[PDB]
């Protein structure tokens, strides 16, 4: 239907795009496909799609959605990524309400691990929201949609006022040049609140009303929320960006250290502070694909027919 992909159904939408589930014809695996029509796109929008792709190519992490292939025709651009079977966290909150702090701590640990790794590779998401935090088949977080993402240098100020309004930091609304990671830490605070409360800390009927709420920095802490969790959120949702917790301080918070000892979380946050599958290559050789050409597509970050098949087969 579209290259080596037979399209199943529309699973979501995006800026001038439609996301559709599809099946790889040679590997029978499921993928997500963003179909962008280039006819409704301008020079600035096309550059914002190239940057999104170039950022997704730099990020290989267990809690980040993996880009497999990029296909481009004279009128269309298709982005093929791994399929998050469980869908958005937002839809899971609509179905079951607020998450228990034990269950929320597990997901939040996964969410910060991915965001820490992004900041590690000098990248800021800038669009963290419940509808962008997807779940795999085992209900584990997979961060997605790097449309607003950008590269940063520590100590620099960004000038792109983008993000999901309910999760956007106050400085974004004010049009102030900001520090990238601090904007993501505000978003993470909102994410943690919506996970444990099943509602937003700042909400309104219109964007004008939402903005007024975000700029006030005042929000209700419900009775069910622990004093340890309240402390963490109150130290992330701080109007002055400099008085917000750092990603390292968030990881070592009393709420984060609560419950059972998690050495797997520690060995993943330490990895951010920094083989070839010959069996797959033999199977690809049988399908009529050259071993040296497969290696050359992997070496060059082409994200072509050979890149996608190796990646899909490694599951």
């Amino acid at each position, epitope marked *: 239907r579209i290259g080596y992909y037979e399209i199943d159904r529309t699973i979501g939408k995006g800026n001038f795009a439609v996301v559709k589930r599809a099946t790889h014809l040679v590997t029978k695996a499921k993928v997500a496909i963003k179909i962008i029509d280039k006819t409704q796109l301008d020079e600035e929008n096309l550059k914002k799609i190239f940057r999104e792709v170039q950022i997704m190519k730099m990020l290989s992490h267990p809690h980040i959605i993996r880009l497999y292939q990029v296909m481009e025709t004279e009128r269309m651009i298709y982005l093929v990524t791994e399929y998050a079977s469980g869908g958005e966290i937002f839809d899971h909150l609509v179905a079951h309400g607020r998450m228990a702090e034990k269950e929320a701590r597990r997901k939040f640990k996964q969410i910060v691990t991915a965001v820490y790794f992004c900041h590690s590779r000098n990248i800021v998401h800038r669009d963290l929201k419940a509808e962008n935090l997807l779940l795999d088949a085992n209900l584990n977080i997979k961060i997605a949609d790097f449309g607003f993402s950008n590269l940063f240098t520590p100590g620099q100020l960004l000038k792109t006022w983008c993000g999901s309004p309910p999760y956007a930091a106050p400085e974004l609304f004010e049009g102030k040049e900001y520090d990238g990671p601090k904007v993501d830490i505000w978003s993470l605070g909102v994410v943690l609140y919506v996970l444990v409360c099943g*509602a937003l800390p700042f909400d309104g009927s219109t964007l004008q*009303n939402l903005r007024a709420r975000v700029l006030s920095g005042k929000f209700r802490i419900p009775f069910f929320m622990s004093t340890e969790c309240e402390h963490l959120i109150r130290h992330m949702l701080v109007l002055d960006p400099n008085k917000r917790l750092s990603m390292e301080q968030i990881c070592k918070h009393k709420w984060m250290k609560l419950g059972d000892a998690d050495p797997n979380f520690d060995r993943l946050i330490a990895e951010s502070q920094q083989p070839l599958n010959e069996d797959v290559l033999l199977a690809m050789e049988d399908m009529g694909l050259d071993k040296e050409q497969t290696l050359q597509s992997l070496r060059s970050d082409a994200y072509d027919h050979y890149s996608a098949i190796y990646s899909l087969l490694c599951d």
Partner: single-chain antibody
Amino acid sequence: EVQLVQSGAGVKKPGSSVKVSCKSSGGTSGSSAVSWIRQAPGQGVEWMGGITSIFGPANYAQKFQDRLKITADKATNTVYMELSGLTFEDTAVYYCARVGDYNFWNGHYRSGYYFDLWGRGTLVTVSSVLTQPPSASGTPGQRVTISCSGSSSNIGSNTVNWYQQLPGTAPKLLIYSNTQRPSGVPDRFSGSKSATSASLAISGLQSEDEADYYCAAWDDSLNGHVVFGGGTKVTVLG
């Protein structure tokens, strides 16, 4: 054709939690904006929560945030409401109501928060802002007027809606968006809004109009909520 079917009545012991269902059966099935509104015996109607913005999963009224959980099964078109830590004050009729203009919401459009469709109500019993006159009266043929005073954050900023409630029935939309009348409402009923106050006028009063009348508006205070009036018992005199 489209109707909200609620779960049956029940008795809960104090401390326990109660779950109420609201299945959308008939006609235009798809996506809706169901809210949960309660009414204690002989008391006014009160908004508890529901979907009221394009931004978040659910919005709860400050009073109910601590004990309410509002969920939805999109697959079966059923919307749920779970109220925990029940007390004798929670004995009431729980209604589910759909926001009429959901299909226009886009973050810029300001919704009217008028309740299009309502469920029959679920009676849950525990055992072991807007100023409206309490009552109004008039002889047949007269024009009776009900006032509804508010603040800048509610009537001053949002549209006013009026509901008529006959005995043993859920409230029914009478006036929406300050002056508009849904199909079925006669020309005798008319609304008006001025600064932070609204008014309902029942011209050519009939015996069939003896009912409770509630006034409502969106309030932009806190994360937003729909506020209701105390209610007015209109009595048709001899």
